Amino acid sequence: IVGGSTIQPERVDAAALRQLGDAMRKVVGSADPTPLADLLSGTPVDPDELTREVGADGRQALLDSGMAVDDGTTFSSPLRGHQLHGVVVLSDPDVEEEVQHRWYVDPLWEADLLIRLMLRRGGARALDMGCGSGVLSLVLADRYESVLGVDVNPRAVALSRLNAALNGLTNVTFREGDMFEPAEGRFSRIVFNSPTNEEGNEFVDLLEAGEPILETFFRNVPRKLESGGIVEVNLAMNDYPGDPFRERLADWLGLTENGLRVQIFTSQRRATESGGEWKRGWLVVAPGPVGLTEVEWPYHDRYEEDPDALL
Ligand SMILES: Nc1ncnc2c1ncn2[C@@H]1O[C@H](CSCC[C@H](N)C(=O)O)[C@@H](O)[C@H]1O
Numbered sequence: 001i002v003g004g005s006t007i008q009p010e011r012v013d014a015a016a017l018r019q020l021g022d023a024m025r026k027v028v029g030s031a032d033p034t035p036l037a038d039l040l041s042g043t044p045v046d047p048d049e050l051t052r053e054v055g056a057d058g059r060q061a062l063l064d065s066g067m068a069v070d071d072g073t074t075f076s077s078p079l080r081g082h083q084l085h086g087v088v089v090l091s092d093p094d095v096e097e098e099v100q101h102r103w104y105v106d107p108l109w110e111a112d113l114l115i116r117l118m119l120r121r122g123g124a125r126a127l128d129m130g131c132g133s134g135v136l137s138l139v140l141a142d143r144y145e146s147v148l149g150v151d152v153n154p155r156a157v158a159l160s161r162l163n164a165a166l167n168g169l170t171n172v173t174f175r176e177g178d179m180f181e182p183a184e185g186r187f188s189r190i191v192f193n194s195p196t197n198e199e200g201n202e203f204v205d206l207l208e209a210g211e212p213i214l215e216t217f218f219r220n221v222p223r224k225l226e227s228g229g230i231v232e233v234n235l236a237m238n239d240y241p242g243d244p245f246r247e248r249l250a251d252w253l254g255l256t257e258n259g260l261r262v263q264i265f266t267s268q269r270r271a272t273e274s275g276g277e278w279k280r281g282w283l284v285v286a287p288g289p290v291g292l293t294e295v296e297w298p299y300h301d302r303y304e305e306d307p308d309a310l311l
């Protein structure tokens, strides 16, 4: 079972983590793999060779944080390292649904894609709902005065704190809780890589939590959003006969009465035997004329061709 490892970033001092993060950044994804890169690829490594790379303190920090485990003759890691969009990120390896622990963290299934979709503006307060590994928080860090990540998974929170510290990000904070409960005040930016996929209405687990998690999210968005602010959501949507997702969404948001503008960019579609349709897409709330617009934009298709073409 994968996703139950103990993660304790508070056990390493801030400078030491940041230095580790710098060491990771120069080797993870390098064409010339070092012990550190091997470690973060899931390969057992010689601790002595590791020690030559990150020093004795770096070695101990790996252990104390839970980033490495002493097998006996080797170190290995339960985590996998990634470098993207200027940050390093550790998360769980990508594994089949049946072997995922309750507290398994999104292995970056879509994050790299979503960051390419994200608007480039900055502002005062940003909120990353269901922050997981923390990845979307990390890239918001340099253009927002503060970033808050929330997750109900306590291991995700620990992992996000770790990743923020690896990247030296002072203005990035994480709270454990249920949706908006720990998120005080309003935010100029709210991002949500929602735990919705194939489960429809029903809760399966923390990564497929059902449509009610979207209803909770959008019902509360207007009271958590700074006017003029921006909301971005990766989500699965179900259209049923006489019951399209977009009309449930408009109701949750109080779209007309609040005068909000919503754009849904639908990338993937699959008709269902109901006569309905499953969709995956990208939803944006942003200033503009009141209303909801849905356009078909195969950005997954584009991303497969050239990721840089969503730039
Ligand atoms: N009640 C709720 N409150 C906070 N987050 C929740 C939740 N139910 C699920 N989540 C979290 O939503 C996250 C979705 S996974 C996405 C993680 C990260 N933002 C990324 O883009 O890679 C999971 O970590 C899951 O634990």
Ligand SMILES: [Mg+2]
Pocket (backbone or CB within 6 Å): 097, 100, 204, 205, 207, 208
């Ligand atoms: Mg699951």
